[PDB]
A paper describes a structure:
In this paper, we describe the molecular architecture of the prototypical bacterial SNARE-like protein IncA, which mediates the homotypic fusion of chlamydial inclusions. IncA is a protein of 273 amino acids composed of a short, cytoplasmic N-terminal moiety (residues 1–34), a bilobed transmembrane domain (residues 35–84), and a long cytoplasmic C-terminal domain that ends in a tail with low complexity (residues 247–273). We demonstrate that IncA folds into a stable, non-canonical four-helix bundle that is maintained as a monomer by intramolecular interactions. Cells infected with an IncA-deficient strain of C. trachomatis similarly displayed multiple inclusions at a high multiplicity of infection, further establishing that IncA is required for the homotypic fusion of inclusions.
To better understand the mechanism of IncA-mediated membrane fusion, we generated high-quality crystals of a chymotryptic fragment of IncA spanning residues 87–246 (IncA87–246) and determined a crystal structure of IncA87–246 to an Rwork/free of 14.1/16.8% at 1.12 Å resolution. The electron density for IncA87–246, including the six N-terminal histidines of the affinity tag, is exceptionally clear, consistent with the low B-factor of the crystal structure (~10.8 Å2). We found that IncA87–246 adopts an asymmetric and slightly blocky conformation, somewhat similar to a four-helix bundle. Both in crystal and in solution, IncA87–246 exists as a monomer, as previously observed for the full-length cytosolic domain of IncA (ΔTMD-IncA - Supplementary Fig. 1a), that sediments at equilibrium as a single species of 23.9 ± 0.8 kDa8. The tertiary structure of IncA87–246 consists of four down-up-down-up antiparallel α-helices, named HA-HD. However, IncA87–246 deviates from canonical four-helix bundles in at least three aspects. First, the helix HB is interrupted at position 144 by a glycine that generates two shorter helices, named HB’ and HB”. Third, while helices HA and HC run parallel to each other making an acute angle of ~ 10° and bonding throughout their entire length, the longest helix HD makes a 40° angle from helix HC pointing away from the Hclamp and gives an asymmetric appearance to the helical bundle. The hinge and the amino acids preceding Hclamp were found to have significantly higher than average B-factors (~ 26 Å2 vs. ~ 16 Å2), possibly underscoring intrinsic flexibility. Our simulations showed that the structure of IncA87–246 is highly stable and is unlikely to be a metastable intermediate.
Author numbering: 86 to 254
Amino acid sequence: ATANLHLYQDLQREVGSLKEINFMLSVLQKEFLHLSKEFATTSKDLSAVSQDFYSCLQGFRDNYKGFESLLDEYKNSTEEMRKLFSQEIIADLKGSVASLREEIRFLTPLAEEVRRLAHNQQSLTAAIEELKTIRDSLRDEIGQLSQLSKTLTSQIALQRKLEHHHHHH
């Protein structure tokens, strides 16, 4: 089994990446709020998908809180708490992080590409379809991450309460 210090270092790397992903998704969220309002009277379908990006990216930081919390538990940890450093779940997280980074890569140019097309009286049909496809992929990835994170939050919270309870004596 992988040493807990190495799993801590793996988690440190992935939580650092999650914080970058969170920041980049906050920028993209705001960009799609703008796009949604800009296009509300010009392209109802573009406006609706743009509002969907705004909505599905709400509270993204909360969707990895269990990982961030786990990382924060290592420094002065008990042996029991360190059982929550699961090599399978940290390896699974690495896949989520990579997939989210790639979704960002594909999404990054698309709002200003829509604006460019619209300013030139060009069709938005293909762009709208691409946006709906990325929205669906991103919802799937965020759901998978959120479930892993929420499980960890529950486990850490209970173990922390238990360890604090022992300080009655």
